[PDB]
Amino acid sequence: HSLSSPNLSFYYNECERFESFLKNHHLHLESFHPYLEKAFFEMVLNGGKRFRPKLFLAVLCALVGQKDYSNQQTEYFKIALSIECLHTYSLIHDDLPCMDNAALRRNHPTLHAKYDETTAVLIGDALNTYSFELLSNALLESHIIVELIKILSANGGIKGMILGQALDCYFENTPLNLEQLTFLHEHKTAKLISASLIMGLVASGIKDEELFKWLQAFGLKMGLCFQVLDDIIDVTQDEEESGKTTHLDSAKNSFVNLLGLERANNYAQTLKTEVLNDLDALKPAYPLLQENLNALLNTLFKG
Amino acid sequence: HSLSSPNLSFYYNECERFESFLKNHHLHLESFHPYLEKAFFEMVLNGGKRFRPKLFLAVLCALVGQKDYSNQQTEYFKIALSIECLHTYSLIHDDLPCMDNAALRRNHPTLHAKYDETTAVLIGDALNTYSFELLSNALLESHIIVELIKILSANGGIKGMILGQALDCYFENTPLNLEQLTFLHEHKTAKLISASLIMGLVASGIKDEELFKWLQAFGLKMGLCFQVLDDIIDVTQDEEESGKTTHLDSAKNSFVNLLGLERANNYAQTLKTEVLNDLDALKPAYPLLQENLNALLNTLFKG
Numbered sequence: 135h136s137l138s139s140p141n142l143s144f145y146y147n148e149c150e151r152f153e154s155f156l157k158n159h160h161l162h163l164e165s166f167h168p169y170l171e172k173a174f175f176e177m178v179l180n181g182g183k184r185f186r187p188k189l190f191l192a193v194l195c196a197l198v199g200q201k202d203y204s205n206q207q208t209e210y211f212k213i214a215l216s217i218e219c220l221h222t223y224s225l226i227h228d229d230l231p232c233m234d235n236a237a238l239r240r241n242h243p244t245l246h247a248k249y250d251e252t253t254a255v256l257i258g259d260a261l262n263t264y265s266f267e268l269l270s271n272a273l274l275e276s277h278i279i280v281e282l283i284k285i286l287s288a289n290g291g292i293k294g295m296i297l298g299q300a301l302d303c304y305f306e307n308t309p310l311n312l313e314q315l316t317f318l319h320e321h322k323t324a325k326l327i328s329a330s331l332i333m334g335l336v337a338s339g340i341k342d343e344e345l346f347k348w349l350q351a352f353g354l355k356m357g358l359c360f361q362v363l364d365d366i367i368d369v370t371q372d373e374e375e376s377g378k379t380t381h382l383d384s385a386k387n388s389f390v391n392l393l394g395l396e397r398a399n400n401y402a403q404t405l406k407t408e409v410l411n412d413l414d415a416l417k418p419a420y421p422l423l424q425e426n427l428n429a430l431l432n433t434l435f436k437g
Numbered sequence: 438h439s440l441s442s443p444n445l446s447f448y449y450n451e452c453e454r455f456e457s458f459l460k461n462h463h464l465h466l467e468s469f470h471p472y473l474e475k476a477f478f479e480m481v482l483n484g485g486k487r488f489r490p491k492l493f494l495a496v497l498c499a500l501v502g503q504k505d506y507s508n509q510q511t512e513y514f515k516i517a518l519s520i521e522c523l524h525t526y527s528l529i530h531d532d533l534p535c536m537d538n539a540a541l542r543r544n545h546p547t548l549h550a551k552y553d554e555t556t557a558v559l560i561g562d563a564l565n566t567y568s569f570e571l572l573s574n575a576l577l578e579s580h581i582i583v584e585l586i587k588i589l590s591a592n593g594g595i596k597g598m599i600l601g602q603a604l605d606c607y608f609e610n611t612p613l614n615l616e617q618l619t620f621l622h623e624h625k626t627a628k629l630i631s632a633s634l635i636m637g638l639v640a641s642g643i644k645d646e647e648l649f650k651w652l653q654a655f656g657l658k659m660g661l662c663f664q665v666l667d668d669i670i671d672v673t674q675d676e677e678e679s680g681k682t683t684h685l686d687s688a689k690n691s692f693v694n695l696l697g698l699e700r701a702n703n704y705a706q707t708l709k710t711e712v713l714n715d716l717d718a719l720k721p722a723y724p725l726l727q728e729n730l731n732a733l734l735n736t737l738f739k740g
């Protein structure tokens with residue numbers, strides 16, 4: 135890392151510490167199944183940018199004082215892991231033969247390729263449910279926990295992430311317009327990204343309705359940008375760099391298919407610019423939060 | 438109905454009222470998907486004995502006074518519906534082509550037969566997540582809600598229902614012993630049945646650790662009995678009576694395959710007898726609870 139403020143340095147360190155927490159997270163299963171214990175958490179451990187926990191932590195590390203943060207660190211990490219579990223579950227089900235049929239994710243074989251289809255369906259299911267187990271076991275105030283579960287379940291469920299996925303699959307042959315593809319991407323991807331942001335504020339304990347509505351809106355815009363960049367990743371990166379299977383392009387609905395690569399790059403660059411401009415509005419009122427988010431987004435936007 | 442006490446009559450009425458609540462439960466989805474709104478709740482509406490909500494209500498109606506119950510009825514019904522949603526999700530994923538490949542459930546076509554495989558996977562996922570949305574939106578005390586989510590997620594997840602399902606599918610060709618099949622059935626089926634029982638006590642607000650441990654143990658024993666009777670249902674009932682596809686018998690692990698029908702009936706009859714005998718221990722201390730559970734189990738055990 136370069137020359138960073140104490141606040142930003144603290145945030146970076148917590149992201150590393152969360153990765154250790156995730157790596158040392160063991161679930162003990164006693165049964166006569168040969169591999170279920172290992173295969174359950176395998177996809178979480180396999181890799182990932184941890185973008186959503188980083189979003190969660192960016193809000194949280196900036197809003198609560200380091201000493202007040204310290205006692206509840208493990209509990210905050212449980213919440214961050216619950217977001218990652220739900221995200222990982224969606225990846226597993228996304229890669230299914232009946233869905234996107236992918237053989238590789240996070241530089242490793244997919245659960246249905248290594249084991250079988252059934253195993254992949256069921257572990258996806260397990261991680262879906264496990265997200266809420268982790269959340270309910272985090273030792274924060276009860277009303278905070280309830281509110282966190284409300285957010286994760288609304289955004290990750292039928293009105294959010296799943297609507298996006300169902301649209302993506304149903305209209306895989308139908309060419310959609312830009313407004314429809316934007317809607318799809320907002321649901322498929324942006325909903326969970328905005329959830330991560332507002333869950334941070336909720337987990338902090340701080341009442342701030344104005345900031346809540348800001349973070350939620352920011353996440354939808356930035357989450358759309360995230361997916362547009364992901365669509366570009368498919369044609370610009372090989373499997374060794376992306377960690378995941380390159381889809382056969384024209385078979386599905388992406389920004390690159392709709393606009394062509396050159397126009398999609400233009401759309402993405404101007405979307406990036408607006409995202410970072412919106413982030414400047416945080417700087418007077420919430421400078422510590424701006425700092426964390428700006429650093430996270432610069433790292434993402436560099437490639 | 439026959440001649441029942443006010444308490445038992447109240448319980449019967451609440452079960453009917455919950456069915457109305459479920460039937461009038463609407464989720465509004467605005468999107469350009471032609472059928473997702475309808476298909477989401479379709480399998481819940483299609484039918485079912487509502488055995489698990491009835492278990493939940495049997496505990497709850499008996500433990501809390503009718504006037505104290507009245508104000509929170511809707512909230513209690515949300516919790517009961519969350520159990521049913523999670524149960525329905527497991528049915529949807531159970532019937533998948535890669536799993537049990539069933540064309541019929543609850544006297545209706547399965548989601549993958551009526552729509553497609555992808556739709557079935559995703560709606561199952563949605564109902565899984567939706568269970569926790571319903572639970573977190575029930576207006577009871579926060580610490581009760583957290584505790585309810587803890588129970589439903591532990592028992593319905595990797596250490597419970599899913600372990601059972603993964604065992605069932607992995608060892609579909611391996612013939613298991615009686616101890617192994619019992620273990621499988623306890624996880625696959627009994628875990629969610631015992632959850633329904635203890636969730637009732639938790640939802641009531643009453644601290645009773647002795648009753649908690651009793652209900653949990655009772656549910657594992659009775660839930661095993663439930664699955665043994667279900668195994669017998671496959672060979673004794675046609676599709677019009679069961680509402681669901683008759684599996685091709687010897688291909689999987691059931692009590693009928695392991696013991697043969699005659700021995701399985703003997704095992705089931707003596708299991709039933711022990712269940713009802715265990716229920717007699719409730720009668721001095723918790724007579725209202727005994728009454729509700731005994732009536733529910735007599736109805737189930739009659740066929």
Ligand code: DMA
Pocket residue numbers: 181182183184185221240322323360361364
């Ligand atoms: C919706 C979408 C783009 C999922 C892939 O997410 P990601 O780029 O965060 O992958 P990972 O979690 O492996 O970092």
Ligand code: DMA
Pocket residue numbers: 224225228234295299322323364378
């Ligand atoms: C919620 C979720 C997993 C969406 C996947 O979208 P995608 O198939 O475009 O993502 P990827 O390119 O990472 O498979």
Ligand code: DMA
Pocket residue numbers: 484485486487488524543625626663664667
């Ligand atoms: C594990 C198992 C036996 C599932 C079928 O449950 P059920 O007999 O309660 O079916 P339904 O929910 O349709 O009444």
Ligand code: DMA
Pocket residue numbers: 527528531537598602625626667681
């Ligand atoms: C948790 C769950 C749905 C288990 C199904 O067991 P099964 O396949 O024996 O049940 P059914 O005979 O109802 O399909």
Ligand SMILES: [Mg+2]
Pocket residue numbers: 228229234
């Ligand atoms: Mg994909």
Ligand SMILES: [Mg+2]
Pocket residue numbers: 531532537
């Ligand atoms: Mg089945």
